[PDB]
Design a protein around this ligand. Structure first.
Ligand SMILES: *[C@@H]1O[C@H](CO)[C@@H](O)[C@H](O)[C@H]1NC(C)=O
Ligand SMILES: *[C@@H]1O[C@H](CO)[C@@H](O)[C@H](O)[C@H]1NC(C)=O
Ligand SMILES: *[C@@H]1O[C@H](CO)[C@@H](O)[C@H](O)[C@H]1NC(C)=O
Ligand SMILES: *[C@@H]1O[C@H](CO)[C@@H](O)[C@H](O)[C@H]1NC(C)=O
Ligand SMILES: *[C@@H]1O[C@H](CO)[C@@H](O)[C@H](O)[C@H]1NC(C)=O
Length: 622
C-alpha cells in the first residue's frame, strides 16, 4: 500500500454482523465467518459495496447470501443489508459470485444460485441444482437539513435459466455465471455481462450476455473465448469490448469485440498474455477487476491482480496497473507486505480512488476498504507525463514532402521512448514504464555512446519476467533509432534488434554492421548477407518492422535488400527476450552511439517511417 494511503477492515471476518432474515420473517444480526468476492461501485453518489456473506465457512459449497454495505458519505458511515437471500433448501444453499452493472439509479446483480450440491459447479452432473439469478436494486437519495441519506430497495430475484441455450455451436450447456465483479453499460446503453459457461464435459469458456432493453431480455452473443477461460471481466474501449479472462495454469487471454461480442479476436498486439497467475504461470489464477476511468482528462484502464509469489490460492501482493492500451504502468502494490489477498475491486469516484479487496489469514477472509491516495497521486503524475510527451511530439512541425508542416510525428501506438535521461546503468523510458539496462556507456545528447565489452542496452521483453508488458512485440512491432558507427568492427558487430529466448544467440529481426562498411540485416534464422554501404561517424536513421511474421529493415527511410522476408515459421508466437541496442559469451564491443529509440506496437507504414526519418533531429527530450 502506498505511503499516504490507508484502509479499514470494512467487512470483518467473525465480527461484522449482517441482518439475517429467518424463515418466519424475524431478523437477527448474525456473525459471518468470511466475506469474499467483493465489488464496490458508485450509484448516483452513493458507494455500494457488494459481497458474499459466507456465514459458516470460507468454502464455496457452504451457506451463503449476498451482503451489501452502502454509504452516502464516501465511507465515513455505512448501512448493512442482505440484498439476496439464498433458497434455504439445505445447509449449503447459496447465492454467490456477484457480477454487477450500474445504470442510472439502478443496480443489476447477477449471481449463481445453488440448493444442495457439495461439489463445484463445473463438476456437476447436470444443471439441476443451479439457477442464474438477476436482481435489481434501486437507489433513492433523499436527505434532510444538512445531511443526505439513502435507501436501497431490492427486487425479487428473477431466474434467467429459461434464456440459456441448451447448446452453442453444438456445445451442450450445463450452467453459467457472471464473470464476477463490476461489468458495464455500453456507450450504446446496452447492459453488458461477461459470463462464464460450463459445458456438459466440464469445459469452461466465456461469452458476452447483454440487454438492449434495460434487462427485460438478454441475448448470448455468438463469439467466445478458448476453453480454459473463466471469471471474465469486461470494459469498453474505443468502440470495442475488451474481455480480460482468468486462465488457470496459463497466461491471461484478452480478446476484443467490435460487434457486441458476435466476433472475438485475441488482443495479440496489446494486452493478451501480458498478465498471469504467478511467476511460473502454472498455478491457479485469480479474479481481476478491469475498469475504464478518466484521469486528468485522459481515458485509461485499471487492472488489479495478485503476484501470487506464494502460489496456489494464497494470492499475495495485489498490484494495480494502469494502461492506455499502449503503455502499461505498474502503479504498485495495494495489499500490505506479504499478506494473502485475493479477489478485488477498484473505483474512481469524485476524483478519489479506492479499492475493496480480500485479505486472508488461515482461510478466514475479510474485505478491506482502501483509500488509494498515494496511488492516485502517482497515477496523475504519469498520466500527465503521457499527455505532455504525446502532445509535444504531435505538435512538432515536420518537413513538408514534395507531392506549413508535413504529417505529424506518429504517436498512435507509441509504447516506449529512450532519449535524453540516462545514467551509466539505466536508460529511462520517457513514458515511465519500462527502462532499459545499460553497460559500458557514456552519455551524449538524447542517448548513449558505447565503449567497452558488452557496451549496449537491454530493453527487456520476456526478460520483464512475470508481467510481460512488451508481449505485443511477438506479434508486431516497429523499433526506431538514430545511430552513428564510431569505430570499424573486427568482423561483424550488432547494432539494434530483437533477440529470442532459447539456446543459441538467436534473433527475430535485427541489424548488424561489418568491417567492409556494409550492413548486415538479420531476418530470423537465415544467414546474413551484407548489402549496401555506410560511412564512419555519419548519422543513420534505423527502423525495424515486424508484422505477419515478416521483417523489414530500413536505413534512411529506404528498405534494405531481403526486406519483407519471413522471420518466423509456424503457428507458435515468437518469444522475444529483449531488444538490444549496441552489443550488450563472446566479448562483443560494438563502437556505436545510439539516440532516440522509439518503440511502437504496430508496423508503421512507409510514409510514417519517412516522417520519422525527416524529423529525427526534432523528437529528442534534450
Ligand atoms: C470486532 O472488531 C472490533 C474492532 O477492533 C473490536 O472492537 C471488537 O472487540 C471485535 N469484536 C469481537 C467479537 O472480538
Ligand atoms: C421466528 O423464528 C425464530 C427462530 O428461532 C425465532 O427465534 C423467532 O422468535 C420467531 N418469531 C416468531 C414471531 O415466531
Ligand atoms: C432451489 O430450491 C428452491 C426452494 O425450494 C426452489 O424454489 C428452486 O426452484 C430450486 N432451484 C432449482 C435449481 O431447482
Ligand atoms: C541511474 O538512474 C536510474 C534512473 O535514471 C535509477 O534507477 C538509478 O538509481 C541510477 N543509478 C544507477 C543504477 O546507475
Ligand atoms: C500511413 O499512415 C498515415 C498515418 O496513419 C496515413 O495518413 C496514411 O494514409 C497511411 N499511408 C499509407 C501508405 O497507406
Amino acid at each position: 500500500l502506498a505511503p499516504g494511503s490507508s484502509r479499514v477492515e470494512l467487512f470483518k471476518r467473525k465480527n461484522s454482523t449482517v441482518p439475517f432474515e429467518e424463515s418466519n420473517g424475524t431478523i437477527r444480526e448474525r456473525v459471518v465467518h468470511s466475506f469474499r468476492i467483493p465489488t464496490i461501485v458508485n450509484v448516483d453518489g452513493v458507494m455500494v459495496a457488494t459481497a458474499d456473506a459466507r456465514y459458516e465457512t470460507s468454502f464455496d459449497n457452504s451457506f451463503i447470501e449476498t451482503a451489501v454495505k452502502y454509504s452516502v458519505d464516501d465511507g465515513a458511515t455505512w448501512n448493512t443489508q442482505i440484498a439476496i437471500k439464498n433458497s434455504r433448501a439445505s445447509s449449503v444453499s447459496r447465492v454467490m459470485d456477484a457480477t454487477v452493472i450500474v445504470k442510472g439509479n439502478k443496480l443489476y446483480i447477477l449471481v449463481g444460485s445453488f440448493n444442495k450440491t457439495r461439489n463445484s459447479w463445473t463438476q456437476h452432473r447436470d444443471g439441476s441444482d443451479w439457477e442464474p439469478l438477476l436482481v435489481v436494486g434501486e437507489v433513492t437519495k433523499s436527505a434532510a437539513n444538512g445531511k443526505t441519506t439513502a435507501t436501497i430497495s431490492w427486487g425479487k430475484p428473477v431466474s434467467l435459466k429459461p434464456l440459456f441455450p441448451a447448446e452453442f455451436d453444438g456445445i451442450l450447456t450445463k450452467e453459467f455465471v457472471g464473470g464476477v465483479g463490476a461489468a458495464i453499460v455500453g456507450s450504446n446503453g446496452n447492459l453488458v455481462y461477461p459470463v462464464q459457461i460450463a459445458d456438459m464435459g466440464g469445459r469452461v469458456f466465456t461469452k458476452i450476455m447483454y440487454s438492449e432493453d434495460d434487462g427485460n431480455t438478454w441475448k448470448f452473443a455468438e463469439g467466445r473465448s478458448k476453453f480454459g477461460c473463466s471469471e471474465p471481466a469486461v470494459l469498453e474501449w474505443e468502440g470495442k469490448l475488451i474481455i480480460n479472462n482468468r486462465v488457470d495454469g496459463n497466461r491471461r487471454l484478452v480478446y476484443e469485440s467490435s460487434d457486441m461480442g458476435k466476433t472475438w479476436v485475441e488482443a495479440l498486439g496489446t494486452l493478451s498474455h501480458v498478465w498471469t497467475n504467478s511467476p511460473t504461470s502454472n498455478q491457479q489464477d485469480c479474479q481481476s477487476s478491469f475498469v475504464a476511468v478518466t484521469i486528468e482528462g485522459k481515458r485509461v484502464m485499471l487492472f488489479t491482480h495478485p503476484l501470487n509469489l506464494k502460489g496456489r490460492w494464497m494470492r499475495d501482493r495485489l498490484h494495480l496497473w494502469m494502461t492506455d492500451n499502449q503503455r502499461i504502468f505498474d502503479v504498485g502494490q495495494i495489499s500490505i507486505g506479504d499478506e494473502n489477498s485475493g479477489y478485488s475491486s477498484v473505483l474512481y469516484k469524485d476524483d478519489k480512488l479506492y479499492s475493496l479487496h480480500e485479505i486472508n489469514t488461515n482461510d478466514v477472509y475479510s474485505l478491506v476498504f482502501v483509500r488509494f491516495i498515494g496511488e492516485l497521486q502517482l497515477m496523475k503524475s504519469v498520466v500527465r507525463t503521457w499527455k505532455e510527451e504525446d502532445n509535444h511530439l504531435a505538435s512538432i512541425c515536420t518537413p513538408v514532402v514534395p507531392a506549413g508542416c508535413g504529417a505529424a510525428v506518429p504517436t498512435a501506438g507509441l509504447v516506449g521512448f529512450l532519449s535524453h535521461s540516462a545514467n551509466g546503468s539505466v536508460w529511462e523510458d520517457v513514458y515511465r514504464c519500462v527502462d532499459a539496462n545499460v553497460a559500458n556507456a557514456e552519455r551524449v545528447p538524447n542517448g548513449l555512446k558505447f565503449n567497452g565489452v558488452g557496451g549496449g542496452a537491454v530493453w527487456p521483453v520476456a526478460r520483464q519476467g512475470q508481467t510481460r508488458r512488451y508481449q505485443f512485440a511477438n506479434y508486431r512491432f516497429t523499433l526506431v533509432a538514430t545511430v552513428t558507427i564510431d569505430e570499424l568492427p573486427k568482423g561483424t558487430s550488432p547494432l539494434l534488434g530483437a533477440g529470442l529466448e532459447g539456446p543459441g544467440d538467436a534473433k527475430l529481426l535485427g541489424l548488424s554492421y561489418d568491417k567492409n562498411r556494409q550492413w548486415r540485416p538479420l531476418y530470423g534464422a537465415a544467414p546474413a548477407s551484407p548489402t549496401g554501404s555506410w560511412e564512419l561517424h555519419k548519422k543513420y536513421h534505423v527502423v525495424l518492422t515486424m508484422a505477419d511474421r515478416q521483417g523489414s529493415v530500413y536505413v534512411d527511410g529506404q528498405p534494405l535488400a531481403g526486406s519483407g522476408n519471413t522471420v518466423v515459421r509456424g503457428a507458435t508466437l515468437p518469444d522475444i527476450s529483449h531488444f538490444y541496442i549496441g552489443g550488450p559469451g563472446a566479448p562483443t564491443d560494438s563502437r556505436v552511439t545510439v539516440t532516440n529509440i522509439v518503440l511502437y506496437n504496430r508496423r508503421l507504414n512507409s510514409s510514417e517511417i519517412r516522417t520519422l526519418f525527416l524529423s529525427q533531429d526534432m523528437i529528442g527530450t534534450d
